[PDB]
Amino acid sequence: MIGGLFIYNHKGEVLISRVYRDDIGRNAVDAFRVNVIHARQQVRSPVTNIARTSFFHVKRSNIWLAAVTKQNVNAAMVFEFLYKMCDVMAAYFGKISEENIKNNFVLIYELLDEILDFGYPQNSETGALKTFITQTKEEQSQITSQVTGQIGWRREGIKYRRNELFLDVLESVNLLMSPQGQVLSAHVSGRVVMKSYLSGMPECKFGMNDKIAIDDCTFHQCVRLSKFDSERSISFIPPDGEFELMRYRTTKDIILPFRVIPLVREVGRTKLEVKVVIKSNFKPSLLAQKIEVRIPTPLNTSGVQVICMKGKAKYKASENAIVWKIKRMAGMKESQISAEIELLPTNDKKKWARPPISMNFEVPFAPSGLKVRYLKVFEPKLNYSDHDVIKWVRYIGRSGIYETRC
């Protein structure tokens, strides 16, 4: 299965390396840095066979994290492992970068040996690693039976002064739309990130608009996934602390919060005149925020000129793209930007190859039309209930990939 496990810095220097199989030597740790991190040609994939050794990787901040193996291993199972590992780390020493790596270098090794035996993912679960990895007989016998049980999310008992919980219905709205204004693709991919501060082994059940009708929805481990495949009960003893209970995808009846409307007209050979227009699309009481509008520029871009009627733009050659930021914008409004671009004819005469207009933005509703209809709690031993349980529900919609061909 997983042979080796290697982290490096932006410079190709080793930070942690733990080999689990004789299959694999220095040879490999070297033969990545060479062939991947210092590689000349960059066009590539995340998996990479070299001399019948395979080389999975991920990057975070400035970091590389590579798995190695001499086998026909479950590829997914690796990347997913790589991810759960990275979660473990950040969720132990904050931010995955060279300082926090080298600073907890023991804590890491200590964890790398617990989470992975002979290349077999064991117990990746941070909510158990923290009962016997530190940043009586009946006291160990628990800390083990918990680790290896069916629950490994919850340290037993350890509980809060008031039973509480929060639900972030985070969503991200994906769009491709031609320069006419015709929706080619568009879907919402959202996730319901609980924060269970409940007490004991609290059983739970979660509803929404399951009939908005959801195109498909994937869970965490904690949801009894056969109860869900008989009834449509999302039953689960939840982790303590924050955790991602389900992701869902929604294609139909979608509150597309912004129409980009581009209008370009070159004036001969050298003068290019660009006019982008936003149209916000929701209750006008509400205001979208953190609005970016990447307006890409020619490669023969001499000129850097703009006049914007709201927000504040700032051209970036190297980016070869205008970046125009609006502090806030209420629902059902309008807004322009304008530009004048100078074209020093670089190569022969390619008619410039125009990217689209991509948009980042936050808005404080569920563009999917998803709403959380209820969230049942129950602890049969320690008797508390709803009517002494706090609850809470937020609703946030980022962009995702909000591309609009221009």
């Binding site: 350890i158 509980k159 809060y160 002064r161 008031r162 509480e164 501060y197 303590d240 009517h387 706090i390």
Partner: peptide
């Protein structure tokens, strides 16, 4: 994190219970 058997919770929203409701 623990302190004396109970667990703690990071926030400055502050506690908001039933909020002008009943058990009727």
């Amino acid at each position: 994190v623990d302190e004396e058997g109970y667990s703690i919770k990071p926030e400055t929203n502050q506690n908001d219970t039933k909020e002008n409701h009943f058990y009727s």
